[model samples]
Target chain A: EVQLQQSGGELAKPGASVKMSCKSSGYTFTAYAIHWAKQAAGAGLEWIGYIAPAAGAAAYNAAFKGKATLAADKSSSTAYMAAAALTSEDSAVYYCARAAAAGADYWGQGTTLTVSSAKTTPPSVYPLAPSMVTLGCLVKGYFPEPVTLTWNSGSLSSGVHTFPAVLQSDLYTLSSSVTVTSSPRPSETVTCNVAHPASSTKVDKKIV
Target chain B: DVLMTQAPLTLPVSLGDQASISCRSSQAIVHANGNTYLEWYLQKPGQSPALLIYKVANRFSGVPDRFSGSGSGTDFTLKISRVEAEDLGVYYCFQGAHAPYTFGGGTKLEIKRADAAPTVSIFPPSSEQLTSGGASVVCFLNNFYPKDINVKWKIDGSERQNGVLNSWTDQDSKDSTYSMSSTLTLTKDEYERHNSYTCEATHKTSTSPIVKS
Candidate 1:
């Protein structure tokens, strides 16, 4: 007789937000933990995290730290999640499941979220830069379908440059890397530039 | 993350024969708290995966005695005494000692061809009347083979549908056979009804339903 009922589907614009819920019944809700999972049409299942409604203790996946938020209300025996800064890539079906000793034993039907943001997000560079003999730069969390990345070191000192940005199912989130064999002197400088066509926006970083 | 690896991607086991699966972890699975977090799971076709072993060698509640787990540190094994048809599925090893638990790729268990029906026995409520507001009746089914079987409950000739039901199906690697158990809870009134309760086990090879009153 255990049951988990979920919230309705949602459609939001880019930068907008949406919240979903899971209402549980027929068992001791606090006795078991509830975990969230995300799935796209073709991508495999991704574990979001689990929350103990009784203790209100939650542990989230490192990848979903800021992208997903988990909360539970003991009075109603329901768990809630609010995803912020929605983008087309964040669109997917989310589920709340019972975390058992074996794994997730039971799951809710699922709630769908469709983000239709037309705005493009320029790439943001991580603070940490790769240095030493092999020079590399990272561009993270960019949006708008495809983003192009290029490397510019005032002077083409030495070595080859190979760059690629891998797209993740998360939609707007992507990881860009620029690998070069050249090592620059302390006095020299290197710059990583990212271009987003959707917004005609370009973001650059100077590796000091 | 501790890397988990399972070897011999596919295992073809014969009926009534022992079958063993190995799982290796990149690092020691022993936790700082003196507990090992290694666990094993079996995912049958189209069914939710079930936990077979936990904490390295401890079998989950209701698991059969023949399904034993051994080894420690970085190496572990899940052995089925007898290979049964119902045992065919993907087996996975998972470690929970660390954050973001990880699972092995999986090892597929294939049974050539086997048939065996479960023997059922019910441990009715220890007392004639419920104590502490309710009572529980456990049905133990064992000495089966080829794993596929169904266990259902009936009260006074009618199907008993409501109540907390818990069940487990396990395999024996020694003889390539399987066993299972099902438990149902009853309210005080239901337990004192004096009506007979039945545990019916059905399998492909069963000429007639195996019933235990």
Candidate 2:
């Protein structure tokens, strides 16, 4: 007889953060684990991860590793999840389910969070430089969550790699690096194209 | 991820007929711990989904005995004894054998008119078990038509309604017929004193109630 009571819907701006709660009752609250799931409109369910209430340990899906945080209050028998640096893509329904031995036996009513903002600042790309044979491009101070960075022009000797975006206070910073075993001519230029969900794109170019 | 696929997108069943649904997975849903991570759920219209069977064939608490689940490897099935009005909904199968669990597309159950009268059978629990603690008696009605049916209980030829009654009706996918099961729980004292406990099934097509003790 396990039951989960959840919080209501939320509306947040692009740079703002949102937190939701799930309260459990009717059993030994600490004996079970709490799992969070995400569902966008018309999309399939995604298992975010689970938090063991007794141990306060958390595990998350790779997609949500840095995007969401899990916490619990043992005395009140409640679990909490906070999502920061909201964007339009983060607007969706989130559910908290009771993780049983085999699967989830009970689930909480979902909470919908909508992220919208009229003002969005695109990311700033720092100058590209070569360290040893690896080329690095740094993009920092972006508003909103989803910004795609791609390498354009100049064939790389090795595959390009994109690093996770780090959030400092309010703004987020991302960096991408590529390894080049052969140096290019003086006329060649490597470009880093940045695109945001707000229908804007920017490009940063540097000479080889 | 174990991909679960449910066939016969729609099921048409008459009252008092047996129905079954199939759920086939892309890969074997068995886990390293020697257990199947398959489950069945029913989502009736606007209501949140409810668990019908878990870990393959084990019914959830308060679930009707008429509902049964069985399968191994990548194939599985969910069968309903009789088609009831409440059973008209979507059925889904889910797999939890791996991370990022997935659910089947879903099978919808629709009601139709009955073709024949229901055949009723009574399965009584052991008297020794009833003497020790309360026991449950199940009445199984099979292959009936036209989703309209009723069931009652009697003690020693007299009408009795003191016990709890749980019933489930579902339709057969092959012939579009129906089936049902009703369970009645009896106490130790009630089981010892009563000469007979009877289950009477009343349906639209039958003049006399189908009785079994």
Candidate 3:
């Protein structure tokens, strides 16, 4: 019953971020290191990174540095990674693996994350005051289900929002869209979130 | 990016001189999993490659007990404790722990004239078909770059036996874009089922190395 299941295939824009998860079951969460890997549709495999839930220490493939981040939650036996500034090459089947030693002996069936075209226009915002602006969040995927989208920061929850579903096809170029308008005076932080039954995290973006 | 090579075309060694091959990865073999993933295979010169040592040190099910693999980071080896006549064939090492996969140039294992043993494949090794077994079938392996040699089989996932099949090495005269095929005796039932099977070709290890089980 030991398993490392992933969220699902995802689609994102070039500058956007996509967060995915690997939920573990059947074993104590601390017994093994959760490893993440990426394999492009027709290319070789690449080690994205890994996390130790017990220690909270993580290591990453230098090639994936800056592009991806790895984290874990011992409380939930889940390992998470989010890729930012997506590109066409980022399209691939990503997997979470478990290992007893320094080598991967077990691998999870991959969860594909593909960077696709922007399906919805970005919500327009003209600052009437120096601190007021509109925020928009969007995402897309191949699975059939209503996606739970949210916008949150720190301790405040903006509740849950829903988006239309994106269908799967051979083109590898489709995605769904979502929009949220908000203004947090003096705070330049807003995160677009998608929560599935597998894992929970917001696809985050920071305005500088 | 070091290019590792296997020698003698046909490997000949009784002991001390172990039959060995080298792997050169575009990157290193180290992975986030903290472990290097890799595996080895045997193709008997004219046969389909079978699993040898996988996951760098563990032997896969049914692999000969003598086949041992040990290596780390960037370099590793797959050694046979003792060579048997059944060991006559080509040896190849592959890295799977990481990506941009690549396979080592294969080396044939010949018994050096005095002990020439030919390993032949029996296509569609199973089934009730005695007369309808020779029909041609294709094996499929895709993804890795440069496309190296591969083996294909029938519906039940069984490999074809020797002499009962036809093979063509797509390596050309120079041995670069590696690809190969073997035919086996398959039954009408197998063909009708539209059975699905996999042909795996390995690739170079970048960052760290991996072993086959």
Number of the top-ranking candidate, with lDDT as the measure: 2
Cα misplacement distance, residue B132 of candidate 3 (Å) = 41
Q: lDDT, candidate 1, residue A122?
A: 63
Return the TM-score for each candidate structure.
0.46, 0.50, 0.41
Ranking by TM-score: 2, 1, 3
Report the Cα lDDT for candidate 1. Answer: 0.66
Model 3 chain B: weakest 10-residue lDDT segment is B115-124
User: Runs in model 1 with CA error above 4 Å?
Assistant: A1-22, A37-46, A81-208, B113-213
Model 2 lDDT per residue over B88-118, tens place? 7788888877665677877888878545787
lDDT of 3 by residue, A1-208 (tens): 8777785556677789988988999888888988776655344345566788888888776767788888888888888998888888888777787765333444565675757674422221111111223222323232322234444543434222122232333211111111224444335454544444222333443322
Over A49-90, each residue of candidate 2 has an lDDT whose tens digit, in order, gives 788998888887767777789999989999999888777788
User: What tier of docking accuracy does candidate 3 attain?
Assistant: incorrect
What does candidate 3's lDDT look like per residue over B1-213, in tens digits? 223344445555553235555544445676687766666766543222456777778887677778888877677777776665567656766665543334566666543222211111122222222243423332212112233233334234554454233233322112122322333334455556655543322334222221110
Name the better of 1 and 2 by lDDT: 2
User: Where does candidate 2 chain B have its weakest 10-residue lDDT segment?
Assistant: B166-175
TM-score of 2: 0.50
